[PDB]
Write a protein that binds this ligand. Structure first.
Ligand code: VDX
Lengths: 9, 239
């Protein structure tokens, strides 16, 4: 999952 | 055989970015889950890697040109190389006298047996230590150390990258700065630059071996629950 990787604003 | 003003500015901004994202006091390590010596070291080393991924992200956004890319390309490059940047940046704590990573007191000193207690085998750890020794023996300047990390992160040949020509141009811009730095700071130059590039080839196979062992660990619930959300996002297989 890329929920956290969305702190790339 | 001389660095332009913008080549020097790239060097200045990269070393400053590293100084801001690498804390030599390791004082944040006490907030990790405690080291313990069935995978008694996995909680602490997972927190260490998860914390280091944050630092790598911070370093990446201060690389000139990186934030100008798409968010998708930024994530694709970060996911593909995060483990390599961590192995690269970990050489600063690696010591040849003890063959270990020393981040302060003996509690935060990591030998190869500690990592065996995180679910990894010698097929990864022994090449990793050999990579650390060979990297240590090159005695890189910190300017060469941070340029290599930036070059590793901006590799166009990563899966999921869309704007390839834009990433390759920024990487070549950094390789040109690194080549000029070596030529000026060192006798000769072509030999050292060649081995630094070879170290990036070594990191590719180290990544490959770690991804296999991580996939085995992450599919066992008793171990996967000891990881962190950021680790599962970054090292996972999702899109
Ligand atoms: C983090 C960093 C440091 C050491 C890196 C190490 C030491 C212990 C074992 C490590 C973490 C390797 C492990 C095989 C990685 C496996 C993690 C996992 C269990 C999720 O598969 C990779 C790098 C090795 C400390 C400091 O230099 C900051 C740096 O930033």
């Amino acid at each position: 999952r890329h929920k956290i990787l969305x702190x790339x604003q | 055989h001389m660095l332009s003003d913008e080549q020097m500015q790239i060097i200045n901004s990269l070393v400053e970015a590293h100084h801001k994202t690498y804390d030599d006091s390791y004082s944040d390590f006490v907030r990790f889950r405690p080291p313990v010596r069935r995978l008694s070291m996995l909680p602490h080393l997972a927190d260490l890697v998860s914390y280091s991924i944050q630092k790598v992200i911070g370093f990446a956004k201060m690389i000139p040109g990186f934030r100008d890319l798409t968010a998708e390309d930024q994530i694709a490059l970060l996911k593909s190389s995060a483990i390599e940047i961590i192995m690269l940046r970990s050489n600063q704590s690696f010591s040849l006298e003890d063959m270990s990573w020393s981040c302060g007191g003996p509690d935060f000193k990591y030998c190869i047996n500690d990592v065996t207690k995180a679910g990894h085998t010698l097929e990864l750890l022994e090449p990793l230590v050999k990579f650390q020794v060979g990297l240590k023996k090159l005695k890189l300047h910190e300017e060469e150390h941070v340029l290599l990390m930036a070059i590793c992160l901006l590799s166009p040949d990563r899966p999921g990258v869309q704007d390839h020509v834009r990433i390759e141009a920024l990487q070549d811009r950094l390789c040109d700065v690194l080549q000029a730095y070596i030529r000026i700071q060192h006798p000769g130059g072509r030999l050292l630059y060649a081995k630094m590039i070879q170290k990036l080839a070594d990191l590719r196979s180290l990544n490959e071996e770690h991804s296999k062992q991580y996939r085995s660990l992450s599919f066992q619930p008793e171990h996967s629950m000891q990881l962190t959300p950021l680790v599962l996002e970054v090292f996972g297989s999702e899109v």
